[PDB]
Design an enzyme around this catalytic site. Sequence first.
Site, PDB file in Angstrom:
ATOM      1  N   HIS A  53      11.056  85.142 -32.877  1.00 23.08           N
ATOM      2  CA  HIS A  53      10.171  84.280 -32.150  1.00 23.08           C
ATOM      3  C   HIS A  53       8.779  84.904 -32.235  1.00 23.08           C
ATOM      4  O   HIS A  53       8.529  85.798 -33.065  1.00 23.08           O
ATOM      5  CB  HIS A  53      10.741  84.105 -30.747  1.00 23.08           C
ATOM      6  N   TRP A  57       5.412  87.838 -27.854  1.00 20.91           N
ATOM      7  CA  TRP A  57       6.268  87.561 -26.695  1.00 20.91           C
ATOM      8  C   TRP A  57       7.653  88.312 -26.715  1.00 20.91           C
ATOM      9  O   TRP A  57       8.119  88.748 -25.654  1.00 20.91           O
ATOM     10  CB  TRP A  57       6.558  86.082 -26.549  1.00 20.91           C
ATOM     11  N   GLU A 158       2.875  75.832 -39.878  1.00 19.41           N
ATOM     12  CA  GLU A 158       2.967  74.389 -39.606  1.00 19.41           C
ATOM     13  C   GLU A 158       1.576  73.764 -39.464  1.00 19.41           C
ATOM     14  O   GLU A 158       1.135  73.517 -38.354  1.00 19.41           O
ATOM     15  CB  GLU A 158       3.816  74.103 -38.409  1.00 19.41           C
ATOM     16  N   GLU A 255      11.959  77.634 -41.561  1.00 20.53           N
ATOM     17  CA  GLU A 255      12.256  77.553 -40.138  1.00 20.53           C
ATOM     18  C   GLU A 255      13.088  76.296 -39.863  1.00 20.53           C
ATOM     19  O   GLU A 255      12.657  75.189 -40.196  1.00 20.53           O
ATOM     20  CB  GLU A 255      10.957  77.477 -39.305  1.00 20.53           C
ATOM     21  N   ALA A 261      13.110  69.680 -31.457  1.00 17.50           N
ATOM     22  CA  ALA A 261      11.932  70.367 -31.989  1.00 17.50           C
ATOM     23  C   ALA A 261      11.167  71.205 -30.936  1.00 17.50           C
ATOM     24  O   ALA A 261      10.398  72.063 -31.381  1.00 17.50           O
ATOM     25  CB  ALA A 261      11.063  69.336 -32.692  1.00 17.50           C
ATOM     26  N   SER A 262      11.426  70.918 -29.687  1.00 19.40           N
ATOM     27  CA  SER A 262      10.871  71.768 -28.629  1.00 19.40           C
ATOM     28  C   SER A 262      11.362  73.201 -28.550  1.00 19.40           C
ATOM     29  O   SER A 262      10.802  74.046 -27.867  1.00 19.40           O
ATOM     30  CB  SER A 262      11.164  71.101 -27.264  1.00 19.40           C
ATOM     31  N   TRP A 289      15.518  79.601 -36.476  1.00 22.34           N
ATOM     32  CA  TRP A 289      14.699  79.915 -35.286  1.00 22.34           C
ATOM     33  C   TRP A 289      15.628  79.950 -34.089  1.00 22.34           C
ATOM     34  O   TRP A 289      16.253  78.864 -33.836  1.00 22.34           O
ATOM     35  CB  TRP A 289      13.655  78.842 -35.135  1.00 22.34           C
ATOM     36  N   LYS A 294      14.989  84.155 -24.834  1.00 22.47           N
ATOM     37  CA  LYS A 294      14.428  83.146 -23.962  1.00 22.47           C
ATOM     38  C   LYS A 294      15.478  82.074 -23.611  1.00 22.47           C
ATOM     39  O   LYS A 294      16.326  81.718 -24.425  1.00 22.47           O
ATOM     40  CB  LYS A 294      13.274  82.453 -24.711  1.00 22.47           C
ATOM     41  N   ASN A 295      15.330  81.516 -22.398  1.00 21.95           N
ATOM     42  CA  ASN A 295      16.229  80.451 -21.996  1.00 21.95           C
ATOM     43  C   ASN A 295      15.851  79.070 -22.595  1.00 21.95           C
ATOM     44  O   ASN A 295      15.261  78.204 -21.991  1.00 21.95           O
ATOM     45  CB  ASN A 295      16.211  80.351 -20.464  1.00 21.95           C
ATOM     46  N   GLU A 296      16.307  78.948 -23.849  1.00 15.13           N
ATOM     47  CA  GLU A 296      16.129  77.732 -24.640  1.00 15.13           C
ATOM     48  C   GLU A 296      17.295  77.720 -25.658  1.00 15.13           C
ATOM     49  O   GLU A 296      17.672  78.815 -26.142  1.00 15.13           O
ATOM     50  CB  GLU A 296      14.806  77.597 -25.323  1.00 15.13           C
TER      51      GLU A 296
HETATM   52 CA   LIG Z   1       8.331  74.883 -35.547  1.00 15.41          CA
END
Ligand SMILES: [Ca+2]
Length: 350
Positions: A53, A57, A158, A255, A261-262, A289, A294-296
């Site tokens: 990531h 971070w 991107e 990626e 996509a979020s 990715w 992280k909480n995702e």
């Molecule tokens: Ca992306």
Amino acid sequence: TAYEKDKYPHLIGNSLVKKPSVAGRLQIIKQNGRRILADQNGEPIQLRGMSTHGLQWFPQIINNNAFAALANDWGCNVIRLAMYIGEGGYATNPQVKDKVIEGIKLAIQNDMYVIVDWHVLNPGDPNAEIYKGAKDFFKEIAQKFPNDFHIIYELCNEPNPTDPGVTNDEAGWKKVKAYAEPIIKMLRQMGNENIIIIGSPNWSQRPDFAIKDPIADDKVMYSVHFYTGTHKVDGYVFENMKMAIEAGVPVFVTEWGTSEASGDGGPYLDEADKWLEYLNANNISWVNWSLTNKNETSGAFVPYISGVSQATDLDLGSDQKWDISELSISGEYVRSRIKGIPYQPIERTL
Ligand SMILES: [Ca+2]
Ligand SMILES: [Ca+2]
């Protein structure tokens, strides 16, 4: 018995997922109408691996034991180092470069290729002022690691319409080329023969611009990025990719994720099976990715969630492996697919 054997047969196996020690210097070859990545001997190769990531971070993944686990337990032959510029990244905290350098050295030490990603995202035009350091950054990495066969350069993650941005048309593509060509030229003048990967408009969804208007360099490939909760096989992104591949454009998935996509939602594994079957069958490299807790949903490692779970540590011990229960649903699935083994998920009942 494994369901992939009947339904998605190219998901099983990893004989083409060769490490640097075996494959050496990469090249692009023409084979039955396709331009594909190959090894030093001209034999097709597939890179499969993971992206960090943002290193501003989640730098904790830059440790030798984690890199060894990725290379050896997960079977990766590539790792991508995502260096944001905005959003607390290199423009404001240039010390993140130190983590990229460290990461290159740890990829090499653990027998992986490494993608150095100048992670354009907000704003969307790689020519924006905030990104003015891009040419000197690539210069510096190439001075430190001259013509190193392990390194792949990714000049602009991107390109996209986030203001100041690029448009999803031929004018937008021209801005990308105008950005990328002087950096490529400089790198080649300096003697670097590395593969260079170039994004495209609409969040690197448009490798098809390279059909009629490619960059004139025989070691450039074009990225395409997708997230399986958003982007489906036979959808917009997929068909732009397919149209480019068919027409002989060299394409590399720098990626992709199993979420929307979020970076969150799902994951969407049945759709990922369809994409990865196509990529593997068509000799397209891929990088997932991401290496975060992280909480995702797209993160590979279990997150801290109050009342539910402590985070998995990204700084790994000398065992050089995470337990599968320390991996998220996405990470467990992706590990399976990198290794080329049947997907046989654990129960997760809290
Ligand atoms: Ca992306
Ligand atoms: Ca570290």
